[PDB]
Design a binder for this molecule. Structure first.
Ligand SMILES: *P(=O)([O-])Oc1ccccc1C(=O)[O-]
Length: 345
């Protein structure tokens, strides 16, 4: 790989701040050599500086954790990716043709309930932030709407799919998702900054606060740090750090978290757009220099995450900006992958 470009990383972070991120940071593990940069504030009211050791909400990066647990259950003979969801969770979905593999790759047609929840960003946050939902409650919210496409037929990202994932985990193991994440992932990889505390609202330890951008241009930021994340659960509620996400995706890509056969299933790409794919709870991004990287994004209120590794896991990158609902910032932060993997132009 090209050398990571720290000057380019610096510029990306600075641009993100100029676009409304209170703070922005990035860590690169380059085959044992660390790159770490941060700019701005973890807490915009106190002025406390952001740092790459600050814990944060990884949002939909959680889907990759959920997928790892499911794929280990496949390895153990407890789950068949091509069995129908309703084989395991009778009567859950309106169509007994929707399979586990389709849910995990967003090909199920299940309506994304979050489009109802967050039609208005800040009011929707205020509505859900202190609520506790069951898995079933979230599925019922989706099922108020028709499916959007035939099973398997179309890619359509939906939180509902990874709510199903958490249900499946809990039903088949008899354990909570927190227990499964801890025993299968957090403990074996020694992820000392990684937690699943749902429905607790506290972020353990030193953390970046999250700042939700309102839908109204120029509006005041809303502190969205403390919330249950019950609206997402196994689709979105993991807490981590840049070091731990780097460790996790390196371990994944280098073959440490499941059999080779299941990793290959995880990397069967469904087209997302001309430069992206989706596997089983896993994203592929194609970079300008002809490198692809593998991992996931997150956008939970107040936190934009990128966490991606090279194919062999030897270079991993995690970037965080502590705002959300700010596509300028989202788009800018994607450029950390360019600078970290493609290097200087
Ligand atoms: P998670 O809920 O963090 O996620 C989302 C939600 C909406 C759009 C995109 C994504 C993502 O980046 O995976």
């Amino acid at each position: 790989l090209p050398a990571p470009d720290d000057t380019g990383l610096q510029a990306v972070l600075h641009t993100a701040l100029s676009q409304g991120a209170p703070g922005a940071m990035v860590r690169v593990d380059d085959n044992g050599t660390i790159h770490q940069l941060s700019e701005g504030v973890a807490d915009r009211a106190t002025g406390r500086a952001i740092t790459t050791t600050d814990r944060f909400r990884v949002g939909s990066v959680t889907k990759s954790f959920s997928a790892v647990v499911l794929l280990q259950l496949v390895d153990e003979g407890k789950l068949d990716l091509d069995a129908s969801v309703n084989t395991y969770l009778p009567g859950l979905l309106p169509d007994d043709r929707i399979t586990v593999r389709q849910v995990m790759s967003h090909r199920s047609g299940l309506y994304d309930y979050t489009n109802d929840m967050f039609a208005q960003t800040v009011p929707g946050f205020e509505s859900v932030r202190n609520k506790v939902f069951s898995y079933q409650d979230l599925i019922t919210l989706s099922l108020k709407h028709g499916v959007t496409n035939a099973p398997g037929a179309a890619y359509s990202y939906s939180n509902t799919n990874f709510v199903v994932a958490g249900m499946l985990i809990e039903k088949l193991t008899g354990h909570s998702v927190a227990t499964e994440y801890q025993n299968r992932i957090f403990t074996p990889l020694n992820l000392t900054d990684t937690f699943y505390v749902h429905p607790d609202t506290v972020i353990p330890g030193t953390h970046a606060n999250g700042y939700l951008t309102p839908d109204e241009a120029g509006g005041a930021l809303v502190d969205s740090t403390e919330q249950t994340v019950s609206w997402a659960q196994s689709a979105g509620a993991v807490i981590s750090s840049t070091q731990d996400l780097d460790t996790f995706f390196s371990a994944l890509m280098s073959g440490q978290l499941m059999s080779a056969a299941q990793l290959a299933q995880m990397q069967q790409w469904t087209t997302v757009n001309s430069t992206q794919g989706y596997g089983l709870g896993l994203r592929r991004r194609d970079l300008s220099c002809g490198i692809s990287v593998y991992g996931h994004t997150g956008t939970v209120q107040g936190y934009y995450t990128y966490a991606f590794a090279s194919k062999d896991g030897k270079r991993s990158v995690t970037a965080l900006a502590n705002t959300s609902n700010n596509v300028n910032v989202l788009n800018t932060m994607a450029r950390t992958l360019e600078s970290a993997f493609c290097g200087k132009p």
